[PDB]
Every structure is written in structure tokens, then in C-alpha cells.
Amino acid sequence: GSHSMRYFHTAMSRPGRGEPRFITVGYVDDTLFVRFDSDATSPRKEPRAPWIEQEGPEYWDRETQISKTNTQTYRESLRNLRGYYNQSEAGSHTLQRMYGCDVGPDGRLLRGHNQYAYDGKDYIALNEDLRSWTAADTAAQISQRKLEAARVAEQLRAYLEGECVEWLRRYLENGKDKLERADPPKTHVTHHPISDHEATLRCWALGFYPAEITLTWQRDGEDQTQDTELVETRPAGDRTFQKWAAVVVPSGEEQRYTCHVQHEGLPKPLTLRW
């Protein structure tokens, strides 16, 4: 089907408590497979999926070295941003980055990504043409002068069109059994009396992969969009996800409500009831 690979970089400064910290995690779709934390005493890239473990030592040392150099680079970027904005070194600051590639079923590239956020707000992003940059403000325009002078776009482009795609295709092959699988959610409903007059109906979805899912409450055919309480989808710790939706209904009228679940592991939407 359609797949993606993504890296997430975070550097956070911590004034009077060390040099800024740097972490990297890698994802193939909803699957964590690799990690790095500059706080670990001899920081190294470590596997987090059975199918990246076969990768050889040349791989793990190369990756570690990438991670180590980024640690220093991000520390320097933080310093430069702080200077652009005239910010105090007493203040904590964060710089994030997501980048990677999206492909479809043929293995074709559909989109490349590479954008930064400073303190949780978009800072500068590589546009979809993989040639131009969008800068948020005048500070970022300074950054853009730097990234243009160093022809960063073109090198990024080359990576996103070739190497990134080739790595994802390889990972998909090596861990095909578990990465191409669709684990359908296990379902049930729970009831919780509130008052004399009402109660809560909760619809549950557990053990599903990937994370994308839709839970709806109906009565008895119309959706209570405005009245359905959703929780953020959460990981179970075992590669799978969990999620629930709840409705407050009047005591005695439970029978007219149905819960409906949609998930790519389900050929047909599921109906559930109390």
C-alpha cells in the first residue's frame, strides 16, 4: 500500500544544566524502529524493531556518526536563533525537525519533507518542489540565506528522491510480514451510570495497527458528532494502538445507540451496541 519513512529531531536547551540535549527517532509508518539520545553516556543509534537489527555494523556506526554531528549542529543552530531574536540565554528553547518521504503502492515518491519548528512554531520548511524554502519571519529569512548559499535544497532533494526511497523500500522488504499487516481492532462497549437521568456509553477499540481509525456513535442511524467524546489514540506498548469514544445518553434509552468502527484491517465497518 502507501508507506512513509520519517525522522524526528528535537534539540532542547537547558540553561545552567548542561549543553542542549538532542534526540532522534525513526519511523516507518506507525512503527518506531530506531533511536538516539545524546544524554546516553556513549550515545549510539539503537534498533527498536526486529527487522532493522539485521543491519550491519557499518550501518550502525554511520548512523551514530550522523546523530553525533547533528547534536553539535543543533546546539549551534539554537545559539544562532537566540542571537537573531535577541533572546536571553536564561530562557529554555526548542528546535525540532521532521523529514522523510512518502510513497504509494508502486514504490513511487509522492512527497518529500523537511521542515523546522523553533519553540513549537513553524520556522522554515522545504517546499514540495524540493527547490524553494518558505520562511516564517525575518529571522528565518536569515537562515534561508545560509541554506541557499550552501545549496542545501538540492542535496536534500537528491536524498529524498533516491536514498530515502531506497531505504524505505528495503525496510518494507525486510520487515514485510509485520509492516504490511493490518491488525483489526478488538471491540466492545462499556456502560457507566452517571445520575438518575443519564449514563455514559463507551465504545472501545484495542490492539489495532496502524493507528488511523474512526469511532462513531449513532442513534439509531444518525451520528452524534457534536456529542461524542474522543480520546487521542494511544499506543499499547506492543506496537498496537488503543482508542475510545463515549456518549452521554439518558437512563433507559441505551438501546437506540450504536457504535461504529472503521479500520483498514476491517473489510466492513463494525457495528456494536450495549
Binding site: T24, I66, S143
Partner: peptide
């Protein structure tokens, strides 16, 4: 595999 462009300086 990450991009080896580890000297991307803002």
C-alpha cells in the same frame, strides 16, 4: 537510513 547532511546550519 538518515541523510548524511548532518551539518545543516540555521
Amino acid at each position: 537510513g538518515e541523510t548524511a547532511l548532518a551539518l545543516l546550519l540555521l
